């Protein structure tokens, strides 16, 4: 822990500065540091952690997809032997992506999830676990691919179970969870019907609970509902 000597509050403060400067690797490092202090995270702090890592891995995923696209094209015969370079560089980016995923999953396992007793914290962390297994699934090709897929599924399902018992259908975390779990069904599990069904049911259940919300809550909920509708339009 290179952040071991810095105050928890200073790490959080610097994470917020890193966000403003769009320094997401720095942000993730500061938030990792904060988690490793061993105290539970607040709502705002969980959001900082998620934003930092989503941006770091988001960059790596975008790069990996570019490199994989080149690798596949260069392996379509008639292209003339590229050499090992595209594969080697795709593998380098892939390994760095897997490292980040393992880091996040490590933080969740040691010991964010086990200490998370409230619905919002537990659902948030379990959603994250599902997400970082999904990212590993996106690049997995070998012996463990199925077990990686099922780890994502298991985390998402546990999050869903808690969210349905403990949260209203408009809760943005519940909505975000269902959004991402739906994408998992479509893109990873090869289950477009399950994806569509989950997104539609989630959208309709939220619609019917919107009347209970303030103007601010309504904005947050309808933001995620729009993303559900966007995906459904993509898929149907």
């Amino acid at each position: 822990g290179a952040m071991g000597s810095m105050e928890r509050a200073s790490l959080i403060q610097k994470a917020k500065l890193a966000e403003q400067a769009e320094r997401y690797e720095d942000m993730a490092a500061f938030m990792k540091g904060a988690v490793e202090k061993g105290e539970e995270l607040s709502c705002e702090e969980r959001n900082l952690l998620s934003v930092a890592y989503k941006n770091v891995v988001g960059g790596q995923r975008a790069a990996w997809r570019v490199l994989s696209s080149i690798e596949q094209k260069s392996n379509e015969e008639g292209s003339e032997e590229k050499g090992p370079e595209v594969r080697e560089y795709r593998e380098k980016v892939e390994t760095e992506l897997q490292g980040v995923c393992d880091t996040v999953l490590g933080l969740l396992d040691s010991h964010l999830i086990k200490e998370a007793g409230d619905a919002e914290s537990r659902v948030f962390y379990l959603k994250m676990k599902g997400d970082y297994y999904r990212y590993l699934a996106e690049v997995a090709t070998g012996d463990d691919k199925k077990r990686i897929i099922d780890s994502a599924r298991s985390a998402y399902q546990e999050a869903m179970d808690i969210s349905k018992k403990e949260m209203p259908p408009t809760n943005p975390i519940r909505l975000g969870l269902a959004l991402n779990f739906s994408v998992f069904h479509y893109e990873i599990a090869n289950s477009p019907e399950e994806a569509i069904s989950l997104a539609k049911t989630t959208f309709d259940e939220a619609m019917a609970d919107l009347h209970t919300l303030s103007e601010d809550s309504y904005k947050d909920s309808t933001l995620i509902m729009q993303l559900l509708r966007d995906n459904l339009t993509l898929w149907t």
């Binding site: 997400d131 975000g176 959004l179 991402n180 994408v183 479509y186 893109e187 995620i224 993303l227 966007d230 995906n231 993509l234 898929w235």
Partner: peptide, 5 residues
């Protein structure tokens, strides 16, 4: 990339 959050 479909929408995720």
């Amino acid at each position: 990339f479909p929408a995720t959050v």
